[PDB]
Each structure stands twice: as structure tokens, then as C-alpha cells.
Amino acid sequence: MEIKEVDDRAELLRYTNNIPLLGKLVNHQPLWSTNPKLKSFSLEKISAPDQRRVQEALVVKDLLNVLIGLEGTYIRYFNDYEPSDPETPIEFKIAKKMDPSFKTFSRRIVRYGKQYMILTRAYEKWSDTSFGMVLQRFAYEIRRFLEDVYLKTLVERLERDFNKVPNFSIRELEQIINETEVNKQMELLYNIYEEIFREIEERRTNQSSQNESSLHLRLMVAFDTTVYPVPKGGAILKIFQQKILENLGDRSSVMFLKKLLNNI
Amino acid sequence: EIKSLKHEIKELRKEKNDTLNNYDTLEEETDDLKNRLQALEK
Amino acid sequence: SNPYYVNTIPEEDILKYVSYTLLATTSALFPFDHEQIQIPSKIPNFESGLLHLIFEAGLLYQSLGYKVEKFRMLNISPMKKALI
């Protein structure tokens, strides 16, 4: 890979009021095909069986980069994803010269890393006080889980297998991930976030259109049902209770989910 | 007037996004011609 | 036996490709699509039958994984969920 000379400059963003307290505070490095630092190698030469081990090593390194949340040599970002705004959809593009084997495995790992980064931006945005301290605690729990389980197991297993384990396979890597079960937990967390997002969409779209016991009782009581743009407190608790109820068959999932619910 | 200024800034952002799409198609064209250079030299 | 099998894929390449065919990924010698494998003709008869059985196992694994994904996307009784 030929090292191409480009201008890599990182400075501090002097503006931090729009970004939450636990959000981004520095500019992003240039993209692969924006300011190239290394010449991309032709994947058709390593698709051959003699260099297919080198191809597998390169694609699993790129997949570890995607898992930790960064771009790879042959797996880069998409057009809809812009590093300057947090609200952009995060998607990746894959070089078609790569064999469809590594392409499908990289599609799976890119789905995993995209869910990871989406949940990252989710709890970063939820750290704000406008979402309520219940959602802030949910965000802190999500961040603590992603810090003490996901990336921990990543660094412990996958990086070690890529570095100091010969005859290792990306299929064995995926099997180890499935055994560690972090992928299923991340998928369920992404589904919960998608349910919260569609709830927010409904509660933001219902713009125009939104007892005699209070009179019988000698109490100055009333109903202030002003709906928020996002669920808060009791709404999040009801949503998570419905999630626990729809969770059917996975007792360990229900267990750690109710543990997180109690912690929140 | 602040809202009108923000709207004009967003229109200029859309124009610059069109220029960035032109930049992206020029980038893919450069990638294609670079593959051409590599295939013709090798 | 070499002059009769100069056009045979080596055992290392055979193993490396059948690894992917079993592990649900395509290959150059075998375009592993949903149903077809497109086995070349340079493979001997017994070897072709053996790889046919192995690709049958691989396709059964493919169907099982697809049905598992469909059932995970769907929702059913907890007993059948534990079965899946």
C-alpha cells in the first residue's frame, strides 16, 4: 500500500452547546477516499487461494475497525453518513472486488458496528437533560454495558485471535461472537431503540389532534397531560415493561433486561 | 430576519451539497481512471 | 496416476473451498447460490459424489439458518421459541 501524503489536522470544536455533555468534542479524521493515506490494494489479486489468507486478515482487520467504529481499507462509509452531524444515518459501503464470502461476513459485522454506533449516538443524545433523568440513566446503563461487555470481549477475543492465533478464520470469529451472545443483545437493544424512535415519531406527528370523581372529591386536582416529544419516566417504564412482556423464551435476556430496568 | 438568514444558509448548504455530489462523481471517475492506469502499466 | 489427473484441483484448495461452501459462503470453483452449485467437470466421479453429499449438508445448513432467521423475525409461543 503506497502511503499518499494528505493533510491530517485535528482541532478542538470550540462550540459545544448543541452537542450534549457526553458527545463529540473533536473533529473527525479524513475519510479513505477523501484524503487517502494508504493506496487501496486490488482485492482481485488476493481473492486467489494463495493470498486468500492475506485477504481474510485484511478484511477481518477492517471488520474490527468497523466494530470499534472506524473505517477500513475496503469497507468505508456511505454517502448518507456525514461526520459533522450526529443525526445522519450511519451506513457503510463495501468494495465489490472482495469475494462475496467476506462481503457477506462484512455485511453482518457492519450491521453490528452500525447498531453499535447508532446506540452510541443514542445514549450521547439522551445524556441531555431534555430527555429526563430516567432516560439519562438508561443512556448511562447502555454506555456502561457497551464499555464493559461489548468492546471488552472484542479486545479480549477477536483482536487476540487476529494477532497471535494462526489458522484463525472469520467464521470462527463469528461463532465466538455468537457464543459470547453480545450480538443478540446488541440486536435487541437496537430493536428497543427503534421502538423508542417510532414512538417518538408518532408523538411528534400527532400535532393537531393532541370524570365526576374529581368533582365528588373535595380536592383541588386536575390533569396536566402535556405530551413530550420523547418518552420520559413512566412512558419509558411502560415501554420497557411491554418489551419484557413481548420477550418470550429468552429467560436470560428477560433477566438482564429487568436488572437494567431496576438499575434505571 | 434571522430565520431568513438561516434559510439562505440552508439553500447555500444545498448548493454545496450538489457541488459535493459532483466531487463524489469526480472521485469515482478518478478511481476508475486510476484502475485504468494500474491495468495499463501492470 | 498424475498424467491422468493433471487437471485436478489440489486437496488443499478443495478443502479451503468446501470450508466456505459448508460455512454458508460462496466460492470461485463452486458458485454457491441458493440451490445450484455449478460443479465443474474436471472432478472425478467419486470425488464429485462426495462433494455433492457435502454440499447437500451445506444446503441443509443454509435452509436451517434461513428458517431460523425467519422464525426469529416472527413471534411464536415460548416453547417453540426455545425450540428455535
User: What is the gyration radius of the CA atoms in chain A, in angstroms?
Assistant: 23
Chain A residues contacting B via beta carbons under 8 Å = 33-34, 42, 79
Q: How far apart are CA C79 and CA A249, in angstroms?
A: 7
Q: Do C25 and A248 touch (CB under 8 A)?
A: no
Question: In this structure, which amino acid lies at residue C68?
Answer: V
Q: Left (φ > 0), alpha (ψ -120 to 50) or beta: where does A99 sit? A: beta
- Give CA–CA dist A52/A60, Å, rounded: 12
Name which of A249, A118, A129, A112 is nearest A193 in CA terms.
A118
Distance CA A102, CA C82 (A): 31
Resolution rounded to one decimal, in angstroms: 9.2
C-alpha cell at C8: 485436478
CA angle, corner A180, sides to A189 and C22, nearest 5? 105
Mutate which: A47, A171, A176, A178, vs C, most C CBs within 10 A: A171
> A194: number of CA atoms within 13 Å, CB side?
8
Q: Are A170 and A63 in contact (CB under 8 A)?
A: yes
Give the CA distances from residue A99 to residues A43, A60, A123, A146, in Å, rounded to whole numbers and listed in that order.
8, 13, 36, 31
Residue B29 forms contact with A (CB below 8 Å)? no
Query: Which among A42, A49, A96 is positioned nearest to B39, based on CA atoms?
Result: A42
Distance between CA atoms of residues C66 and C64, nearest Å: 5
Rounded CA separation A63/A69 (Å): 9
Contacts of A243 (CB under 8 A, 6+ apart): A192, A195, A257
Place of cell 489440489: C10
**Going by C-beta distance under 8 Å and a sequence separation of 6 or more, which residues neighbour residue A172?**
A161
Measured CA to CA, the distance from residue A101 to residue C47 in angstroms comes to 24
Q: Any contact of B with C, at least 3 CB pairs below 8 A?
A: no
Q: How many angstroms separate the CA atoms of A111 and A78, rounded? A: 13
Cα A44 to chain centroid, rounded: 31
Which of A152, A127, A157 lies closest to A142 in space, CA to CA? A127
Q: Give the distance from residue A248's alpha carbon to the nearest chain C alpha carbon, in angstroms.
A: 5
Query: What is the residue whose three cell numbers read 439553500?
Result: B11
Experimental method: cryo-EM
